[PDB]
Design goal:
The chain has about 350 residues and is α+β, with helices and mostly antiparallel strands. The protein contains 11 helices and 10 strands. α3 packs antiparallel against α5 and α5 packs antiparallel against α9. It binds the ligand O=C1Nc2ncccc2N[C@@H]1Cc1c[nH]c2ccccc12 and potassium ion (K).
């Protein structure tokens, strides 16, 4: 059976139009509602449909954000429409079934690690989309492998699920119990309500580490135990470090503990540039962590800037250097490193 609805295009001019889709099936569940998978009658293309109960009085954060964003490493909002005593906002997004979580798991059940080339690819695209959204003052606040969608053929990564995303404003408080526990920044565990988009960088570091290790680097049993797991690696933070985090709750029973050597945390083979990048992302002090652009310009990604580089299946790497001035907003003179002359 075919369903026709009147939907406004997410990126185009605010003009409604009739849109038709068929073959609808439930693929997702959350505290927000339901996520369906359908096929557009016109294009034949597959989409996901996130159905969210909305209150007329208040505007939807995710919708306001998805209409701003237009990036290759970010899931696209095709259209959006309302369905029936309550109203549901329906977001029509690009359907990409494969996730980084699924891929990593596939390897880790095999007890082997993902090839470094795939790791460099995925992470780089992640920092790109992050550099993009951070330029608007927008923080994703739910960076995790399950929200990184992959096209296996092109190896293109797209950030998705902006259900926790928000445009941060200085002086305005934000919720501390946010983000997936394993990827939750330390300041959040300290109850900080005045944090920056640098928490996403933390989460990104957690993703990188998990791809090198084959398992999550900080596997907390609770919101507080997560901190202990962090400590078991970074040691206990100095008072200056805790000050930078700006905690709502001052302290926990934990004793002073010396840090573990990064080298020893990872496997013996693990590349040094990878490890070196991890230590720069996973810092206690939020201001000490790299910006998404600085991370892209890291030595770890130099293999991608080689003019001879190709995919393992012989195909060419996706557009990795098509930077907009909006993306370079953070630090424009990094363009002479991010953009190799052969790519100009
Ligand atoms: O935008 C997305 N598109 C997708 N396409 C295929 C698989 C997963 C996703 N995720 C986001 C849509 C989404 C967002 N939250 C979800 C929860 C359950 C299932 C799906 C979602
Ligand atoms: K509409």
């Amino acid at each position: 059976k075919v369903t026709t609805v009147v939907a406004t295009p997410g990126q185009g001019p605010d003009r409604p139009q009739e849109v038709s889709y068929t073959d609808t099936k439930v693929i997702g569940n959350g505290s927000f509602g339901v996520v369906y998978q359908a096929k557009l009658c016109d294009s034949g293309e597959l989409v996901a449909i996130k159905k969210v109960l909305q209150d007329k009085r208040f505007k939807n954060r995710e919708l306001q954000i998805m209409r701003k964003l237009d990036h290759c490493n970010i899931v696209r909002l095709r259209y959006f429409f309302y369905s029936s005593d309550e109203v549901y906002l329906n977001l029509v997004l690009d359907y990409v079934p494969e996730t980084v979580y699924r891929v990593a798991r596939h390897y880790s059940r095999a007890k082997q690690t993902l090839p470094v080339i795939y790791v460099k690819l995925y992470m780089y695209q992640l920092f790109r989309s992050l550099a993009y959204i951070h330029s608007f003052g927008i923080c994703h606040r739910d960076i995790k492998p399950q929200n990184l969608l992959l096209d296996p053929d092109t190896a293109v990564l797209k950030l998705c699920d902006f259900g926790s995303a928000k445009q941060l404003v200085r002086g305005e408080p934000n919720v501390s119990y946010i983000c997936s526990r394993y990827y939750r920044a330390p300041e959040l565990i300290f109850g900080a309500t005045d944090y920056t988009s640098s928490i996403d960088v933390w989460s990104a570091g957690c993703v990188l580490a998990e791809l090198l290790l084959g398992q999550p680097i900080f596997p907390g049993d609770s919101g507080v135990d997560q901190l202990v797991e962090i400590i078991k690696v970074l040691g206990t933070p100095t008072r200056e470090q805790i000050r930078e985090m700006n905690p709502n709750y001052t302290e926990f029973k934990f004793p002073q503990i010396k840090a573990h050597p990064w080298t020893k945390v990872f496997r013996p083979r693990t590349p040094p540039e990878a490890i070196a990048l991890c230590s720069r992302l996973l810092e206690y002090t939020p201001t000490a962590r790299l910006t998404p652009l600085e991370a892209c310009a890291h030595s770890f990604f130099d293999e991608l800037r080689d003019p001879n580089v190709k995919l393992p299946n012989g195909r060419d790497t996706p557009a990795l250097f098509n930077f907009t001035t909006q993306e370079l907003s953070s630090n424009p003179p990094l363009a002479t490193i991010l953009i190799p002359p052969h790519a100009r």
